[PDB]
Design an enzyme around this catalytic site. Sequence first.
Site, PDB file in Angstrom:
ATOM      1  N   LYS A 210       0.659  -1.397   0.105  1.00  0.00           N
ATOM      2  CA  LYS A 210       0.054   0.003   0.047  1.00  0.00           C
ATOM      3  C   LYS A 210       0.924   1.100  -0.064  1.00  0.00           C
ATOM      4  CE  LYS A 210      -4.527  -1.649   0.964  1.00  0.00           C
ATOM      5  NZ  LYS A 210      -5.263  -1.812   2.356  1.00  0.00           N
ATOM      6  N   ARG A 250      -3.847 -10.255   4.581  1.00  0.00           N
ATOM      7  CA  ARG A 250      -4.275 -10.341   3.200  1.00  0.00           C
ATOM      8  C   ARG A 250      -3.020  -9.773   2.778  1.00  0.00           C
ATOM      9  NH1 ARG A 250      -5.973  -6.856  -1.013  1.00  0.00           N
ATOM     10  NH2 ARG A 250      -7.265  -7.905  -2.527  1.00  0.00           N
TER      11      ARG A 250
HETATM   12  N1  LIG Z   1     -10.362  -6.850   3.007  1.00  0.00           N
HETATM   13  C1  LIG Z   1      -9.638  -6.373   2.457  1.00  0.00           C
HETATM   14  N2  LIG Z   1      -9.699  -6.296   1.184  1.00  0.00           N
HETATM   15  C2  LIG Z   1      -8.857  -5.433   0.178  1.00  0.00           C
HETATM   16  N3  LIG Z   1      -9.161  -5.513  -1.250  1.00  0.00           N
HETATM   17  C3  LIG Z   1      -8.513  -4.967  -1.783  1.00  0.00           C
HETATM   18  C4  LIG Z   1      -7.407  -4.093  -1.713  1.00  0.00           C
HETATM   19  C5  LIG Z   1      -6.822  -2.946  -2.719  1.00  0.00           C
HETATM   20  O1  LIG Z   1      -5.387  -3.522  -2.733  1.00  0.00           O
HETATM   21  P1  LIG Z   1      -4.796  -4.492  -3.936  1.00  0.00           P
HETATM   22  O2  LIG Z   1      -4.917  -3.951  -5.012  1.00  0.00           O
HETATM   23  O3  LIG Z   1      -3.402  -4.603  -3.287  1.00  0.00           O
HETATM   24  O4  LIG Z   1      -5.369  -5.661  -3.827  1.00  0.00           O
HETATM   25  N4  LIG Z   1      -7.206  -4.117  -0.193  1.00  0.00           N
HETATM   26  C6  LIG Z   1      -8.024  -4.579   0.873  1.00  0.00           C
HETATM   27  C7  LIG Z   1      -7.814  -4.575   1.970  1.00  0.00           C
HETATM   28  O5  LIG Z   1      -7.010  -3.976   2.822  1.00  0.00           O
HETATM   29  N5  LIG Z   1      -8.769  -5.597   2.745  1.00  0.00           N
END
Ligand SMILES: Nc1nc2ncc(COP(=O)(O)O)nc2c(=O)[nH]1
Length: 274
Positions: A210, A250
Amino acid sequence: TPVQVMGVVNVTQDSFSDGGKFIDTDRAVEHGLALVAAGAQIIDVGGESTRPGATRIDPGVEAARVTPVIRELAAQGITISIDTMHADVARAALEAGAHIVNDVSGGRADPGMAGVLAEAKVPWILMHWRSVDADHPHRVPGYRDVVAEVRTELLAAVDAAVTAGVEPERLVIDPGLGFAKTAEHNWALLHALPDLVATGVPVLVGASRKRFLGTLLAAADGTPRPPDGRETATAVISVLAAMHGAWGVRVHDVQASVDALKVLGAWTSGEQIG
Ligand SMILES: Nc1nc2ncc(COP(=O)(O)O)nc2c(=O)[nH]1
């Protein structure tokens, strides 16, 4: 009770990020298989992006992208979460074999999501994202106390889920790091992770790659660290999150976080006997 490592498979990003023309189910499936082989407990499958300037797609297209991937991974006995804000997409993903719904809107994007989850009786992850202005969905609001307000709003989402008939035991909450939040907001939320764990609701943390890690690791001249250079930082967050009681993390780089959690486990038990 070990931390669950949730590895991310985004079918759209896997298919298109490096310039590909056609949706590539097999590439996404092999990606998920590789994350499981690297130690992931859960594969989080997504078809959409929410970041500014993403390509926008219809929910029918979102479902058509994720369901073949979910069907093939579920046939191998893998536990699968569907990363969607859209109730019809969640329903199709559950039909295809997903067993968890991961909603970055926390049920606010689709008034039908609670009813889908109440009927399906599977876990529902409610992520925190305060997004009052759909024309500026990432604008950082004025928090008086981001820690207390994130907790209050997550628990209000939990209440609304239970009112809709979701069983309390099936809810997970997530502080939504970086979603209309500054780097300093993120670090306060992470330091306060025990407070959120103390709600008794399982807590998922998503810090992987992030923007605040790009900021933390910025060069001497102010250039943020590129996303690929954020993986050591991400893995350390997995360890600190595990130490402070998070139910899950995650991550994109499952191997790095699994490596880090193996170090934590080996350290913790180093003097145990018998
Ligand atoms: N629960 C949860 N779901 C998510 N889905 C997408 C992304 C967006 O980030 P990415 O593009 O790196 O997947 N971040 C989260 C998060 O921090 N928590």
